[PDB]
Coordinates of C-alpha atoms in Angstrom, one line a residue:
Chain A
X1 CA 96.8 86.1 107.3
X2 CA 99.6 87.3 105.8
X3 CA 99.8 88.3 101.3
X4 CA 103.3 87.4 100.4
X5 CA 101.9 86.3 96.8
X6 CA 101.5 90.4 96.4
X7 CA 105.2 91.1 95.9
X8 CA 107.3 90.1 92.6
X9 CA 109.6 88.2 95.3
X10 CA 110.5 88.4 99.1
X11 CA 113.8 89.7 100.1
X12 CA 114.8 86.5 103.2
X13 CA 116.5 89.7 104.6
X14 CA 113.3 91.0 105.9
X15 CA 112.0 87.3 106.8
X16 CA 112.8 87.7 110.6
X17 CA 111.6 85.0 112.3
X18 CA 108.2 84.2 110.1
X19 CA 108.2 80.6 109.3
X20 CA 106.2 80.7 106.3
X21 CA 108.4 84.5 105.0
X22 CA 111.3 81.8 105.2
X23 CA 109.7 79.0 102.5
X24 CA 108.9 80.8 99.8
X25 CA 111.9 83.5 100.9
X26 CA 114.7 84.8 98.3
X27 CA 118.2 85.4 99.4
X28 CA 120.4 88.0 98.0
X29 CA 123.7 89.0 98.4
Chain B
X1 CA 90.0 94.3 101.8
X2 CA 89.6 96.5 104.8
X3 CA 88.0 99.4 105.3
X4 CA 88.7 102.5 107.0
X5 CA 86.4 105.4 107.8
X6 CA 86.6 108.2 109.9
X7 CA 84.4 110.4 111.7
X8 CA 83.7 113.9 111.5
X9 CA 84.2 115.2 108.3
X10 CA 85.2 118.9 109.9
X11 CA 85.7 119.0 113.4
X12 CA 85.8 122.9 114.6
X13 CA 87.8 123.1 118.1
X14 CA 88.4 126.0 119.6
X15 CA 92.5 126.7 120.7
X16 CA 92.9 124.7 124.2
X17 CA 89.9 122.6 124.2
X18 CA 90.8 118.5 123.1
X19 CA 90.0 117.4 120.0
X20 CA 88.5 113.9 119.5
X21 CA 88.6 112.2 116.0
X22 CA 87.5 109.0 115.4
X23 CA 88.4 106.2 113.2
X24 CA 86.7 102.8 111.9
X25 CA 87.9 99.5 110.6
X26 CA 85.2 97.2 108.6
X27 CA 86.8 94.3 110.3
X28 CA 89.2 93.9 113.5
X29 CA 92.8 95.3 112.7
X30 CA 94.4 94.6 116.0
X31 CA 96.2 97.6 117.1
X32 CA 97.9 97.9 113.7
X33 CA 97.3 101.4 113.1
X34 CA 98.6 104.7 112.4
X35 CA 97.8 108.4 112.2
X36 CA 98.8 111.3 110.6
X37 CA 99.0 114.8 110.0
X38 CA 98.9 116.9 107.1
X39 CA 99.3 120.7 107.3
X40 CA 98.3 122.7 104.6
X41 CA 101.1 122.6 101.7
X42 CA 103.3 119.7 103.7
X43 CA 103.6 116.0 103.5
X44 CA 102.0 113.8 106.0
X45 CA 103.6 113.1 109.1
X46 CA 103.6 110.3 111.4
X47 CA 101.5 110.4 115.1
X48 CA 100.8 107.4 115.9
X49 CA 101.4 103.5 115.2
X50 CA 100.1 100.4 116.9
X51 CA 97.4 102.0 117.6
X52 CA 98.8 103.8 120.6
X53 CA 102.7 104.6 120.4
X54 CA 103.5 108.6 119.6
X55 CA 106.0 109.0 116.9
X56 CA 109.6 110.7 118.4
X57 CA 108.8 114.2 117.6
X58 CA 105.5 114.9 118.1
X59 CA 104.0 116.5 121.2
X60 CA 102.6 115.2 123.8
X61 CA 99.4 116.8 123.4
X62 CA 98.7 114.0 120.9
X63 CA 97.6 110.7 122.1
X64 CA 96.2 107.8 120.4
X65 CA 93.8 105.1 121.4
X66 CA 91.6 102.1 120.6
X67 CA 91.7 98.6 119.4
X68 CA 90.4 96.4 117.1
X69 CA 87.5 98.0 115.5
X70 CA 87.1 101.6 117.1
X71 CA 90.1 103.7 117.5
X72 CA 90.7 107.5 118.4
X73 CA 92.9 110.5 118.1
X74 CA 92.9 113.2 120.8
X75 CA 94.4 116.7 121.2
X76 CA 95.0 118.2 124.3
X77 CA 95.0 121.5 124.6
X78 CA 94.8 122.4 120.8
X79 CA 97.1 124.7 119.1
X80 CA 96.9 127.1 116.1
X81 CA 99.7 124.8 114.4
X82 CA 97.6 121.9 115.0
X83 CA 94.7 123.1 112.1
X84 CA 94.8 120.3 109.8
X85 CA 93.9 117.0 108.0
X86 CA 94.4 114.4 110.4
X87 CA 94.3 111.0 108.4
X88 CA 94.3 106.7 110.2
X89 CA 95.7 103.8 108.0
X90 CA 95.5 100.0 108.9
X91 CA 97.9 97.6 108.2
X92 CA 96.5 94.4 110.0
X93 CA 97.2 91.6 106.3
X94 CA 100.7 92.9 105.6
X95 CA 102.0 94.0 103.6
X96 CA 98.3 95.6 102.7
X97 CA 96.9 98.6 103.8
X98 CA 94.5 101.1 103.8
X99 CA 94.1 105.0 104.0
X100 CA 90.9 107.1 106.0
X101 CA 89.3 109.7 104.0
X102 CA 90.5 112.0 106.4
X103 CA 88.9 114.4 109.1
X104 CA 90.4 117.8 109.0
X105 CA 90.1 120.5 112.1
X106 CA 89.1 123.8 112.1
X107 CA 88.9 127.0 113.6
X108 CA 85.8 127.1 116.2
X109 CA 83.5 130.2 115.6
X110 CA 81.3 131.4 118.4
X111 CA 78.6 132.0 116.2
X112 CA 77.1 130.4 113.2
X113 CA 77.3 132.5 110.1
X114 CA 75.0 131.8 107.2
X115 CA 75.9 131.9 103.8
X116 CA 75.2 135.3 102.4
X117 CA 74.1 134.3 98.7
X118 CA 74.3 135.6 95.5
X119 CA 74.0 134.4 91.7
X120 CA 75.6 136.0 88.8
X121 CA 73.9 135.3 85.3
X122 CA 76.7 134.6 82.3
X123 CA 78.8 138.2 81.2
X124 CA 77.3 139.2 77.7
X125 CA 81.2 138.9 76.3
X126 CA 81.8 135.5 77.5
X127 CA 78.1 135.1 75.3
X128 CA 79.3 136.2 71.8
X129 CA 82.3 133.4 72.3
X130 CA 80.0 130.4 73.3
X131 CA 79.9 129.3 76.4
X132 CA 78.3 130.5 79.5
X133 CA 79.1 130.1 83.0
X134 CA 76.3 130.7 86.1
X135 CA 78.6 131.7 88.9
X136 CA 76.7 131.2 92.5
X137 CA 78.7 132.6 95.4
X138 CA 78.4 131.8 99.8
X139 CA 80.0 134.2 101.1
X140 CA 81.7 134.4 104.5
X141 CA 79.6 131.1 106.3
X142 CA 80.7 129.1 109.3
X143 CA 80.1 125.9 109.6
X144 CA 82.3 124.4 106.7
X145 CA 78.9 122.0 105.7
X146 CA 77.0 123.7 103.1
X147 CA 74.8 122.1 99.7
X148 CA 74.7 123.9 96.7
X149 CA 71.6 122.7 94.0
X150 CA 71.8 124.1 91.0
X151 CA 68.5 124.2 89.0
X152 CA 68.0 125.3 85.1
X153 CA 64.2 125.6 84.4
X154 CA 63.1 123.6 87.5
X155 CA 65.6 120.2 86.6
X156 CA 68.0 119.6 89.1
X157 CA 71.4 119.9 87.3
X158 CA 74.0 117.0 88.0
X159 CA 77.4 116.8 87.0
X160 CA 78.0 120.1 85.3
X161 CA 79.2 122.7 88.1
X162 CA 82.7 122.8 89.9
X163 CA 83.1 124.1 93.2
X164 CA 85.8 125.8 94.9
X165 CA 86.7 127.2 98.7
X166 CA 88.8 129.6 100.1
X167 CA 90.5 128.5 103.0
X168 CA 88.8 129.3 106.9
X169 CA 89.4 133.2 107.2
X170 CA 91.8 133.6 110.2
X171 CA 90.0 136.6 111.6
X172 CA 86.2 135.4 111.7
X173 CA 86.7 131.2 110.8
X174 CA 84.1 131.7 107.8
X175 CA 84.6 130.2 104.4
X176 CA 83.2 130.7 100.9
X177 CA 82.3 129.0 98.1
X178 CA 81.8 129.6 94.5
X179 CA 80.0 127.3 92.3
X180 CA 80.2 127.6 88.6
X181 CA 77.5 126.0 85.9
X182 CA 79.5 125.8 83.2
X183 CA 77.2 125.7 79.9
X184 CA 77.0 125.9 76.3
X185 CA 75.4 129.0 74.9
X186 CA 73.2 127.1 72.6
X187 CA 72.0 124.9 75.9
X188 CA 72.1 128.5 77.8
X189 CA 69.7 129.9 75.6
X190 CA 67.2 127.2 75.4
X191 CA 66.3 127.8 79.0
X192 CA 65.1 130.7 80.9
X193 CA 64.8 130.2 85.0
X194 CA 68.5 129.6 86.5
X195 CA 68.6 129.1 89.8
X196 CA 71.2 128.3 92.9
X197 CA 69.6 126.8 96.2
X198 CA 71.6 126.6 99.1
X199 CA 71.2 124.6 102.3
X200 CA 73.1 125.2 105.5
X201 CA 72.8 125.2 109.4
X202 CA 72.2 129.3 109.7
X203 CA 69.5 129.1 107.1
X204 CA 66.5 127.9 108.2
X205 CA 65.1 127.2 105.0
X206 CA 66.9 126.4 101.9
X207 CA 67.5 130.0 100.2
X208 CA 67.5 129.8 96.7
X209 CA 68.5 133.1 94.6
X210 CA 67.7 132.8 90.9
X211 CA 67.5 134.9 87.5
X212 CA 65.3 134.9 84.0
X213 CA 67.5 135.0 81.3
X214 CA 66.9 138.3 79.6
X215 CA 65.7 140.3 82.0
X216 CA 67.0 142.5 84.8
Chain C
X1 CA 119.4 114.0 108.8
X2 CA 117.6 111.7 106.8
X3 CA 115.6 114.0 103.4
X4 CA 114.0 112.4 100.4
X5 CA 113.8 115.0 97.4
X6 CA 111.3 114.2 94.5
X7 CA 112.1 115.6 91.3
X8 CA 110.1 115.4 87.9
X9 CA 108.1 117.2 85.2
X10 CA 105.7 120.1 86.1
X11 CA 103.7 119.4 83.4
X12 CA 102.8 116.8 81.5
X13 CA 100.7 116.1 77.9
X14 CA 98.2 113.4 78.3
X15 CA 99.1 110.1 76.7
X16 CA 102.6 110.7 77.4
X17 CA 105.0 109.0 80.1
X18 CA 105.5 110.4 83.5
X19 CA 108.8 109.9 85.2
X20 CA 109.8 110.6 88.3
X21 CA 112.7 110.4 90.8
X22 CA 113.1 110.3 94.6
X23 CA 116.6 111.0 95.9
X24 CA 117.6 110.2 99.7
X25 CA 120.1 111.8 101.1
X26 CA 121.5 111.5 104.4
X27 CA 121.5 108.4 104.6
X28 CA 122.0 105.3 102.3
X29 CA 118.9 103.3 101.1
X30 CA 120.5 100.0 101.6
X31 CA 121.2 101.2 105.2
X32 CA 118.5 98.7 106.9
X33 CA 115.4 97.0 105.2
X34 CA 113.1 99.4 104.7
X35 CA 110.9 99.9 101.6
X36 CA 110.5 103.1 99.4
X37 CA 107.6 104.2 98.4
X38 CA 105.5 106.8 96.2
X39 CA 102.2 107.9 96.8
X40 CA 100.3 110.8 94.7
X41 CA 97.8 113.2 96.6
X42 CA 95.1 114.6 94.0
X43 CA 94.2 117.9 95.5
X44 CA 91.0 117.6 97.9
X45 CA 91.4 114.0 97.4
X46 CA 93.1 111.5 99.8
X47 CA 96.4 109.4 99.8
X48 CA 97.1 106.9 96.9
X49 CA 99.9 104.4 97.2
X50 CA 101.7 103.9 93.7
X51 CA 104.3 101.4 94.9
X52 CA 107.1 100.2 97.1
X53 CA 110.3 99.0 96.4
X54 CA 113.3 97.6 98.0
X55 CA 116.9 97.6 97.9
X56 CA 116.7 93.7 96.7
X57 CA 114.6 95.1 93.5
X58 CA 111.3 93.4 95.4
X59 CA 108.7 95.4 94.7
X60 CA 104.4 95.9 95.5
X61 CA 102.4 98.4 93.5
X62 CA 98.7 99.0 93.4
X63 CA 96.9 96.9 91.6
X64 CA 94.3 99.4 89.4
X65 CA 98.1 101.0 88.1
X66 CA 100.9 98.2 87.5
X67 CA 99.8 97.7 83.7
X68 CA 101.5 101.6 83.5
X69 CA 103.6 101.6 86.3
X70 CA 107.4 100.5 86.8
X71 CA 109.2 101.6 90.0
X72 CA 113.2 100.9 89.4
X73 CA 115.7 101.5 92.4
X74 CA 119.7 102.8 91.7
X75 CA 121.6 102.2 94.8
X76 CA 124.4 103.7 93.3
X77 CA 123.1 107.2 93.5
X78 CA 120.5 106.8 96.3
X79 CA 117.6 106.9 94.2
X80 CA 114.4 105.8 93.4
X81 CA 112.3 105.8 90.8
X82 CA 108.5 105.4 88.7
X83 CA 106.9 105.6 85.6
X84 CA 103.0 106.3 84.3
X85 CA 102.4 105.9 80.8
X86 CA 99.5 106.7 78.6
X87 CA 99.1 109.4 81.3
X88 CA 95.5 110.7 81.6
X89 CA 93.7 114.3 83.9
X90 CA 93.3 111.5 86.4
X91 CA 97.0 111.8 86.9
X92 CA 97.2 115.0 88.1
X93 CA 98.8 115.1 92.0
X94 CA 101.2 115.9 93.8
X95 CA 103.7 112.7 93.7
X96 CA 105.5 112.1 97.3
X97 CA 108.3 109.4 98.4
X98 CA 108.2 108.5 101.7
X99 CA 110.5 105.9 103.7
X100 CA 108.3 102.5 104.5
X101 CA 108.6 100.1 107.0
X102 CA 107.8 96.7 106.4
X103 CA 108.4 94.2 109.4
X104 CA 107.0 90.9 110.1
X105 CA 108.5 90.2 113.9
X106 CA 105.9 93.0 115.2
X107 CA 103.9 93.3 112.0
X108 CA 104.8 97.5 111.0
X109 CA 103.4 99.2 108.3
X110 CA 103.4 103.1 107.7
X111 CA 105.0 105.9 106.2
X112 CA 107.8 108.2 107.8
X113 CA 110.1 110.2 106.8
X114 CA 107.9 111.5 103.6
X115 CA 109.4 114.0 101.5
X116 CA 107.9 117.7 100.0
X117 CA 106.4 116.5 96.7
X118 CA 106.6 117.1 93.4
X119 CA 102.9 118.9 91.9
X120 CA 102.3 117.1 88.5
X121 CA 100.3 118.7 86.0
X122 CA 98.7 117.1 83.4
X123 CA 97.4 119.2 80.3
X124 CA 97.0 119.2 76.4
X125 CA 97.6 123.0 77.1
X126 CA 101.5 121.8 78.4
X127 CA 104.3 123.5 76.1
X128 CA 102.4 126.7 75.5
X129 CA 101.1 129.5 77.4
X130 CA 97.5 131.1 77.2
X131 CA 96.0 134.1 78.5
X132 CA 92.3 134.5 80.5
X133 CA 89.6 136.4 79.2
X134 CA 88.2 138.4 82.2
X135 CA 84.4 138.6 82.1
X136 CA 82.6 140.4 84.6
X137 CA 80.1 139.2 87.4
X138 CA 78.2 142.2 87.5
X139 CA 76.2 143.4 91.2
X140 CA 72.8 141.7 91.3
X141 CA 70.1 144.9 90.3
X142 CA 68.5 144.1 93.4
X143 CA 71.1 144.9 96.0
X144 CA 72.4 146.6 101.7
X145 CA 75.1 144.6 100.9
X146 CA 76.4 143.2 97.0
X147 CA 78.8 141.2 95.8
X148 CA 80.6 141.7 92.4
X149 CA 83.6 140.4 90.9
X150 CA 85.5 139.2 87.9
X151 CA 85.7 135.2 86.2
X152 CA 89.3 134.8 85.0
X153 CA 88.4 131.8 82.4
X154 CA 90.4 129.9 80.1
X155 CA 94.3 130.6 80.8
X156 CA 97.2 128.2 81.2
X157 CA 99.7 127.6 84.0
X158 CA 99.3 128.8 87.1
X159 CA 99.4 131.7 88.3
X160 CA 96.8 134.8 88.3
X161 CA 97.3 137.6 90.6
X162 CA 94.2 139.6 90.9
X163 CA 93.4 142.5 92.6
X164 CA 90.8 145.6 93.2
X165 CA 91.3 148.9 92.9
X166 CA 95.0 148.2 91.9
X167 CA 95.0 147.2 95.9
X168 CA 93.4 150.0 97.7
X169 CA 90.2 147.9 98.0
X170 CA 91.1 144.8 99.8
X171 CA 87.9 144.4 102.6
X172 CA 86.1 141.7 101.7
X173 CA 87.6 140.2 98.6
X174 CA 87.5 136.5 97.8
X175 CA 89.9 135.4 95.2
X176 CA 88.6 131.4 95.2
X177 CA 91.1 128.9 94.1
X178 CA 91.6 128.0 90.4
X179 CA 89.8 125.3 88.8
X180 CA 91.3 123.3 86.5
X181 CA 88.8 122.5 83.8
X182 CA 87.9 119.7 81.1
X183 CA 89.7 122.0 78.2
X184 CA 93.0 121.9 80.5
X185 CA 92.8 125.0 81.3
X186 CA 92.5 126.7 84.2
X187 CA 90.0 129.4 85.6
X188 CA 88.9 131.2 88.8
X189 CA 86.6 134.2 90.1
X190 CA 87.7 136.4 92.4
X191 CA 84.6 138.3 94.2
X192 CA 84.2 141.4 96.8
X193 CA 81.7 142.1 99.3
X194 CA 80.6 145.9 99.0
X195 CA 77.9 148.5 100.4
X196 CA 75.0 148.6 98.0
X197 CA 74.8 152.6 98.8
X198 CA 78.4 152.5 97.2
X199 CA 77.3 150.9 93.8
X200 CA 76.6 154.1 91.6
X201 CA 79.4 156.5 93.5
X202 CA 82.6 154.2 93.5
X203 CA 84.0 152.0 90.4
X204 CA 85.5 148.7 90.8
X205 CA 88.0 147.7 88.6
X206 CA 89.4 143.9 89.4
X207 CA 93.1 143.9 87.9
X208 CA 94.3 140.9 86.4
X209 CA 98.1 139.5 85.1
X210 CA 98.5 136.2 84.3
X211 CA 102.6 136.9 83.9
X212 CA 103.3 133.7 82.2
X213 CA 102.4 135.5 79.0
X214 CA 102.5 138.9 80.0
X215 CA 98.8 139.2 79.8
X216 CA 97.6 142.2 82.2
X217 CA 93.8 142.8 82.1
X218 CA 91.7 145.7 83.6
X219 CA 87.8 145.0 83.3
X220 CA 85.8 147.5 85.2
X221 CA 82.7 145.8 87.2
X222 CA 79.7 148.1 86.6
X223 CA 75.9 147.3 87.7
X224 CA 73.9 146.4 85.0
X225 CA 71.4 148.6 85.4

């Protein structure tokens, strides 16, 4: 159980290897 | 969300003997957890995390343990620099957390100390400008735990004192306390018995010193 | 070495904006993915998370502060920073920034390095300077041991000194912490332990000087008698 809805967006660059980090993920340069 | 408490409030351990503070989640947090210390006037620092791993840095003497529910923070061989607020966090639904209220430790005293107790009615000056203040003083007690009632004409006042501590004297671990009734003048005069009762393990019964407005 | 620096106001009006900036040095902020964080500590109160923010701009705050909170991040000079407006007493902490790490692989959360703080504050008293009126707490008529001392009410900032006998008497004296009261100002009591036998032969004078307005007070404690 995991609250990714909490931040304004997710950096992909902290993702590691979380499946579900990587759908909703942001990239940035 | 998750819950952290932590147990004692004070824990008085004398220098070389281990200290054991606990800490306990409302629900299972895996070993996601961390502890930390706060000397007087500093930031935290890290201890612990995962429950079990000691921060590069800290001395061996602290070691953590525990998992899921019921975790536990011991020092070995306790050291003067080691007097402080020792505080857990869980972090098991990232990126959420939670703090413990803390459990700070102090000096250990051989003997217990009673408050010694006195009440100080409102200074005639302060009187002419309008307010009054009761001051009620515990002087020089050991352990930290100590209730303070305040009571105008026999009604248990609520709300209306503040409270303050010195820190545990480094010669004889005691501490004191003043608590102050703060109170208008016209509110101050309506009444006549003001009273402080205080409650604490060298007293066998509640002592309660008090004074009649007007007289001596 | 890795050091994060707060800087800010040391006072602040109520109603008004706070702002506040963390600067790390040492090191660069976009060096790895950790989060920044601040987190105030009101004193005998625990630890309150404000926010975290990282180098991308993402960004978490607690919840019962984002309507007056905005946390901003200037890689350019290493800092970070926050903001609480309409201010209120409540506000009134020391405001840390601490390093954060935030990893999913082995789920890590906590706080380390943290920096000194920044004490905040908050008074309608801020921009001025007030003096204490020192009343007396005169030795019970019933006293073997008493206790007398001196209440140093209504001044603004920090700090008194006090002390008795201009310092010869210094057995037994409790000078208790300042209390920082619903008026914004500040007050205190500073209180000695003495023979009863003692009461009618020596005088006790407390001495009082709040500096920050050149205020110096010397109220002799008498019995009432």
């Amino acid at each position: 159980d995991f609250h990714f809805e909490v931040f304004n967006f997710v950096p992909c660059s902290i993702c590691s290897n979380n499946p579900t980090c990587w759908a909703i993920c942001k990239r940035i340069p | 969300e998750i819950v952290v408490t932590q147990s004692p409030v004070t824990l008085s351990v004398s220098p070389g003997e281990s200290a054991a503070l606990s800490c306990r989640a409302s629900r299972s947090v895996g070993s996601r957890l961390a502890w930390y210390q706060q000397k007087p006037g500093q930031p935290p620092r890290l201890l612990i995390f995962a429950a079990s791993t000691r921060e590069s840095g800290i001395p061996a003497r602290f070691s953590g343990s525990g998992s899921g529910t019921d975790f536990t923070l011991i020092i070995s061989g306790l050291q003067s620099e080691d007097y402080a607020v020792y505080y857990c966090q869980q972090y098991k639904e990232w990126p959420l957390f939670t703090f413990g209220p803390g459990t700070t430790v102090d000096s250990k005293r051989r003997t217990v100390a009673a408050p010694s107790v006195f009440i100080f009615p409102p200074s005639d000056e302060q009187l002419k400008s309008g307010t009054a203040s009761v001051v009620c003083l515990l002087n020089n007690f050991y352990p930290r735990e100590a209730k303070v009632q305040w009571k105008v004409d026999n009604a248990l006042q609520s709300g209306n004192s503040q409270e303050s501590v010195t820190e545990q004297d480094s010669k004889d671990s005691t501490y004191s306390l003043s608590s102050t009734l703060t109170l208008s003048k016209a509110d101050y005069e309506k009444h006549k018995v003001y009273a402080c009762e205080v409650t604490h393990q060298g007293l066998s019964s509640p002592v309660t010193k008090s004074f009649n407005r007007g007289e001596c | 070495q890795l050091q994060l620096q707060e800087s800010g106001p040391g006072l602040v009006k109520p109603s008004e904006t706070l702002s506040l900036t963390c600067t790390v040095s040492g090191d660069s902020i976009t060096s790895g993915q950790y989060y920044w964080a601040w987190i105030r500590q009101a004193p005998g109160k625990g630890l309150e998370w404000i926010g975290s923010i990282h180098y991308s701009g993402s960004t978490y705050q607690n919840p019962s502060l984002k309507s007056r909170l905005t946390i901003s991040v200037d890689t350019s000079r290493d800092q970070i920073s926050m903001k609480l407006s309409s201010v209120t007493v409540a506000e009134s902490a020391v405001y840390y920034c601490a390093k954060q790490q935030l990893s999913l692989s082995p789920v890590e959360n906590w706080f380390d390095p943290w920096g000194q703080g920044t004490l905040v504050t908050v008074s309608s008293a801020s921009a001025s300077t007030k003096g204490p009126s020192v009343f007396p707490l005169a030795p019970s008529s019933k006293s073997g041991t008493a206790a007398l001392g001196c209440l140093v009410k209504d001044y603004f900032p920090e700090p008194v000194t006090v002390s008795w006998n201009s310092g010869a008497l210094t057995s037994g004296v409790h000078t208790f912490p300042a209390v920082l009261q619903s008026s914004g100002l500040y007050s205190l009591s500073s209180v000695v332990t003495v023979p009863s036998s003692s009461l009618g032969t020596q005088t006790y004078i407390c001495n009082v000087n709040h500096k920050p307005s050149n205020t110096k007070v010397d109220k002799k404690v008498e019995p009432k008698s």
